Copies of this chain bind each other. A is one copy, B any other.
């Protein structure tokens, strides 16, 4: 769910998840996808394409188990859908941290309705 996703992003990046990524670019946080603005945005692009296959559970609302072990996100044992969900979230958290170097605050509260349509996943 959003709780686990936010904790992952915080653990990896060290930044307030909602504040930095809740409305970043055309892809991060709320709503769907758009053409990515930068690398950080593209993380969330891959993120939401990863969600697409999870038709068996709710990426926003369904809780799952994971642990923070030796500064590594370790997805606990779940059902297939929740396990993949956890992996989706882990991947975007890592990706967001990897791309902090080009994080641009002008995208932080990006006006998403004016984003160009995204390619099919």
Q: Which residues of A contact B (CB under 8 A)?
A: 2-3, 16, 18-19, 22-23, 30-31, 60-61, 109, 111-114
Given contacts A23-B30, A30-B31, A18 and B109 within 8 Å (CB-CB): yes
Q: Are A113 and B19 in contact (CB under 8 A)?
A: no
A7: min CB distance to chain B, Å: 12
A110: min CB distance to chain B, Å: 9
* Cβ contact of A23, chosen from B18, B60, B111, cutoff 8 A: B18
Q: Taking CB as reference atom, which chain B residue is nearest A31?
A: B30
Interface centre among A19, A61, A109, A112 (most CB of B within 10 A): A109
Return 20 A-B CB contacts under 8 Å, by A number. Answer: A2-B111, A2-B113, A2-B114, A3-B111, A16-B109, A18-B23, A18-B109, A18-B111, A19-B109, A22-B23, A22-B109, A23-B23, A23-B30, A30-B30, A30-B31, A30-B112, A31-B31, A60-B113, A61-B113, A61-B114
